[PDB]
């Protein structure tokens, strides 16, 4: 159930009859009161009819109007939130819907609301996946984070929120109801991890989080491996990332065994470089405090375990977080350098701000020992993703077409949505280097196709598929700055369906 | 009395018959020669008017023409000096003559020399105004900066300067001397440790400097405070621009206490970056060498107190230098860091650059102990105060407006001039953050008063005012590249009047 303040119900009752502080209606631009609010305008003997005549309410989407108490109501006020004139809505317009809802409920004193909008019809989406939007949605629209403020907001008085479904839907509602719960909460985690800064969301407390999860989740085993283990692995280019900073690096691994013994695992791969400097070849100075987010990949994947294990499904999963901090120093990895990685490949390091790739094909080297059916990457990997899909949409890179497929689709389930780019073997050359097996940076062009391409050289061996979340991971400026929790719902639907 | 090799005398005796290696006599540009000058021209029966009459010398301020032994004269040499055709000069013009008269002094073999200038006249200043600036401006030029140099110039001969002053005036001129000799020795130990080089000055040496000041001055108590005691008192944005450098950071305490015990003190805040890389937003290579003047500010608290030691004013002056030096390494503070401050209140680190304000705000929580009746902070804060004000004039910020006149009014008068900017509280929105209480830069706009929108946080409980002397601290390029000593006549001025 979700963990930060809120409880979700689903019911089958008259919204007409149904004691609750705020009860919160659909009205359509331009088209008739649909049938749970003709229902409740009939019980008041047409007070809702007589004031949308008066026209106040347009009814475009997210518009609202609140009113008091009502005739033969036992609803303390009524919210009534525009749908627009269309027959059904997108799942843009469904959210912005949702959301205008929370930021009303959200600075009422009631203690609860029921939202009576199984009217709606949302293209595509039936009860099931039209609740999993929801209450994603309103669950992930309570996120705050504010433990370094002295000042913090009053707390919400709203703790409940009531679901309305016909009796028909109700176990769809349920269902989607409580995987979105699980998604949320695992966002939420994502999201604090993602927004800690540097100097205390470091490797090795990355390492602390996941033996609290461990604590937390008893279907949890967790082990943390430090800079002598990994030597003794031979994970060259990960220790060379690592080398610069004090903070010692860490690959934390994460094992949940939901299924049979005889079933492969899926592995998730996560990049967490906790701060990017660059290194060496150092970055700019603007916006540089952005880099916190560059463990957005791990975070996914602490968020996607949390939500898997509070929804306990029946797989085997695998978290591997490759976790280092990229300083500048006298010790630092230098343009030029050549490392051996753990699959024993060599590889020429011509700019050490493109590190993310280092710690990863270490990581996907490790993933091998699990014979997985799966191995799913996901970092914050080039600022030219960013460029090619922008901010909403995460880009996608696989060696199997079949997994990229999967991927895809459950991003367009999630509204989470990624996008495919190719791997085609002409892209590889951007990679030769005259003096080692590999370059770690192509040039200028298709940055984030180079920086797959990489990646492929070290998951020949199993199905995987590389998520470049650079774009989706964050929000750069303004009041919402800050993680995004992207990519768990993605992530979290697929082994959904992997489950089934 | 002035330390730098320069004895200065006030005498009213009759320049005619003054026995002196070169008397110095002042000639105006088309307008007849003034009281002194035609005493001495018919002393020699007419002798420098009939030179001046030859035309060789126009009479532009600070043009000269150099006369040997003239009839019925003990001077050995004449110096004119053009004085313009106007009836009184500026501040900037009687600077100019004074330069001019010491240029062409310095490059004698006299050992001394007489200035009979008292017939001059300078707008809005009688004879104490005038003499404090012509004794500063001639000690000053004396400055002399050559330690790291194998070959050192000759040594001047000119080793006494007399000031002649009718009886009437004696007095205020010797006063007026005496103070401006005074500043001139704390402007030239302002001068020495801003111009030391950042692998001789970092802030264990200023420790040691202001323990040798001590062993000087009776009157003067020292403690200095290392990283244990730092942390102690829980000043963690002061620590945090340390951590990244080598070089321990110090928090220096000085306190004169020349006045009652029920009197409040005045506090100079001085900012002592010994040396500013910017840190990880490491600053470009270009000019980088004068960040070895981004202590400049607490060199000039260190000024200040040379010159109010040496004339025992009554007031109590308390000092709180806040050294550290700011480099990047695999420990240093990363954009995105939060740190809590001494005040309590928390700071995102947004630029590691903008460090100056980080040693500040702790300063000035810590001096809140002394319940002082006046808080100044110095410091070479923003190049956008270059931007606005240039590098003649000083910006000045502050809380409250009888202060800041305060201010002002000593500028004008020591011709070292600062310039009000405005502190309204719309600034301040620059500075929130949606993470921690204060962000430590504001956007490109009003970048000067955004850093006092942040140092004014942390002095509410007091009277306080704020220096950015950024573009007055020291001269960039040319033959004169190095350290002003500014703001020491400023603030010395200031102290004279609090003291009366
Ligand atoms: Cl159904
Ligand atoms: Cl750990
Ligand atoms: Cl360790
Ligand atoms: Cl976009
Ligand atoms: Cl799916
Ligand atoms: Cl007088
Ligand atoms: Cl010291
Ligand atoms: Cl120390
Ligand atoms: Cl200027
Ligand atoms: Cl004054
Ligand atoms: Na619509
Ligand atoms: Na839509
Ligand atoms: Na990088
Ligand atoms: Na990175
Ligand atoms: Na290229
Ligand atoms: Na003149
Ligand atoms: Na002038
Ligand atoms: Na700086
Ligand atoms: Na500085
Ligand atoms: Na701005």
């Given at each position: 159930y979700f963990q930060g303040g809120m409880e979700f119900l689903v019911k089958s009752v008259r919204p007409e009859t149904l004691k609750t502080a705020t009860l919160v209606l659909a009205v359509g631009e331009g088209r008739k009161l649909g049938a749970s609010a003709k229902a409740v305008d009939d019980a008041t003997g047409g007070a809702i009819s007589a004031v949308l005549k008066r026209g106040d309410?347009?009814?475009?989407?997210?518009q609202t109007l609140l009113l008091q108490s009502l005739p033969?109501?036992?609803?303390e006020r009524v919210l009534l939130v525009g749908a627009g004139k269309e027959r059904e809505l997108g799942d843009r317009q469904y959210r912005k819907l949702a959301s205008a809802v929370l930021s009303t409920l959200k600075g009422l004193a009631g203690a609860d609301a029921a939202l009576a909008l199984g009217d709606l019809a949302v293209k595509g989406r039936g009860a099931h996946a039209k609740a999993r939007l929801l209450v994603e949605t309103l669950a992930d629209g309570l996120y705050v984070f504010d433990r370094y403020k002295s000042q913090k907001a009053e707390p919400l008085k709203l703790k409940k929120l009531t679901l309305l479904a016909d009796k028909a839907d109700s176990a769809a509602v349920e269902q989607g109801s409580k995987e979105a719960q699980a998604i949320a909460n695992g966002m939420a985690l994502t999201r604090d991890l993602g927004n800690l800064p540097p100097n205390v969301c470091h490797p090795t407390f990355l390492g602390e989080q996941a033996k609290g999860l461990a604590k937390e989740f008893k279907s949890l085993k967790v082990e943390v491996l430090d800079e002598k283990k990994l030597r003794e692995l031979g994970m060259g280019s990960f220790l060379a990332v690592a080398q610069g900073s004090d903070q010692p690096p860490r690959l934390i691994i994460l094992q949940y065994n939901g299924?049979?013994?005889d079933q492969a695992p899926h592995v998730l791969v996560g990049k967490?470089?906790?701060?990017?400097?660059?290194?060496?070849?150092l970055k700019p100075g603007?916006?540089?405090?952005?880099?916190?987010?560059?463990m957005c990949g791990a975070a996914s994947v602490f968020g996607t375990f949390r939500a898997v294990l509070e929804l306990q499904l029946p797989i085997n999963l695998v978290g591997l977080l490759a976790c280092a901090e990229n300083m500048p120093s006298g010790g630092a990895t230098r343009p030029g350098d050549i490392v051996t990685t753990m699959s024993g490949q060599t590889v020429?390091?011509?700019?050490?701000?493109?590190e993310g790739r280092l710690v990863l094909c270490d990581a996907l080297t490790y993933?091998?020992?699990?014979?997985?059916?799966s191995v799913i990457d996901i970092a914050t990997l080039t600022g030219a993703c960013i460029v090619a899909l922008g901010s909403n949409t995460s880009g996608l890179m696989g060696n199997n077409e079949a997994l990229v497929r999967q991927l895809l689709k459950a991003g367009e389930f999630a509204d989470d949505r990624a996008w495919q780019l190719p791997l085609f073997d002409?892209?590889?050359?951007?990679?030769?280097s005259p003096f080692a097996d590999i370059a770690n940076i192509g040039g200028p062009k298709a940055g984030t196709i180079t920086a797959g391409c990489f990646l492929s050289r070290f998951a020949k061996k199993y199905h995987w598929a590389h998520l470049?979340?650079?774009?989706?991971?964050?929000?750069?400026?303004?009041?919402?700055?800050?993680?995004?929790?992207?990519?768990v719902p993605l992530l979290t639907q697929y082994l959904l369906e992997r489950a089934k």
């Amino acid at each position: 159930y979700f963990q930060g303040g809120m409880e979700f119900l689903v019911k089958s009752v008259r919204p007409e009859t149904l004691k609750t502080a705020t009860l919160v209606l659909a009205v359509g631009e331009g088209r008739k009161l649909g049938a749970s609010a003709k229902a409740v305008d009939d019980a008041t003997g047409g007070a809702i009819s007589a004031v949308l005549k008066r026209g106040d309410l347009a009814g475009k989407v997210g518009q609202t109007l609140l009113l008091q108490s009502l005739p033969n109501l036992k609803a303390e006020r009524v919210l009534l939130v525009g749908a627009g004139k269309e027959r059904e809505l997108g799942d843009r317009q469904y959210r912005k819907l949702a959301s205008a809802v929370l930021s009303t409920l959200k600075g009422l004193a009631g203690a609860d609301a029921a939202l009576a909008l199984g009217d709606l019809a949302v293209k595509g989406r039936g009860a099931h996946a039209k609740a999993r939007l929801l209450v994603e949605t309103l669950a992930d629209g309570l996120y705050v984070f504010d433990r370094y403020k002295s000042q913090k907001a009053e707390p919400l008085k709203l703790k409940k929120l009531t679901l309305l479904a016909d009796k028909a839907d109700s176990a769809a509602v349920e269902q989607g109801s409580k995987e979105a719960q699980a998604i949320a909460n695992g966002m939420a985690l994502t999201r604090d991890l993602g927004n800690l800064p540097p100097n205390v969301c470091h490797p090795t407390f990355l390492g602390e989080q996941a033996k609290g999860l461990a604590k937390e989740f008893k279907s949890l085993k967790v082990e943390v491996l430090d800079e002598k283990k990994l030597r003794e692995l031979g994970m060259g280019s990960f220790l060379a990332v690592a080398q610069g900073s004090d903070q010692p690096p860490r690959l934390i691994i994460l094992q949940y065994n939901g299924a049979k013994k005889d079933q492969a695992p899926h592995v998730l791969v996560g990049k967490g470089i906790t701060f990017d400097t660059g290194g060496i070849s150092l970055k700019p100075g603007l916006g540089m405090d952005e880099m916190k987010f560059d463990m957005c990949g791990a975070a996914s994947v602490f968020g996607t375990f949390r939500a898997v294990l509070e929804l306990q499904l029946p797989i085997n999963l695998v978290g591997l977080l490759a976790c280092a901090e990229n300083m500048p120093s006298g010790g630092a990895t230098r343009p030029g350098d050549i490392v051996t990685t753990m699959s024993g490949q060599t590889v020429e390091i011509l700019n050490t701000d493109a590190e993310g790739r280092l710690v990863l094909c270490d990581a996907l080297t490790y993933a091998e020992r699990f014979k997985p059916q799966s191995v799913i990457d996901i970092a914050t990997l080039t600022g030219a993703c960013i460029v090619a899909l922008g901010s909403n949409t995460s880009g996608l890179m696989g060696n199997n077409e079949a997994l990229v497929r999967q991927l895809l689709k459950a991003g367009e389930f999630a509204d989470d949505r990624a996008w495919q780019l190719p791997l085609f073997d002409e892209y590889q050359e951007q990679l030769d280097s005259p003096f080692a097996d590999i370059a770690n940076i192509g040039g200028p062009k298709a940055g984030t196709i180079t920086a797959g391409c990489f990646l492929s050289r070290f998951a020949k061996k199993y199905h995987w598929a590389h998520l470049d979340i650079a774009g989706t991971a964050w929000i750069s400026g303004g009041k919402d700055k800050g993680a995004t929790g992207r990519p768990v719902p993605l992530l979290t639907q697929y082994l959904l369906e992997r489950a089934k």
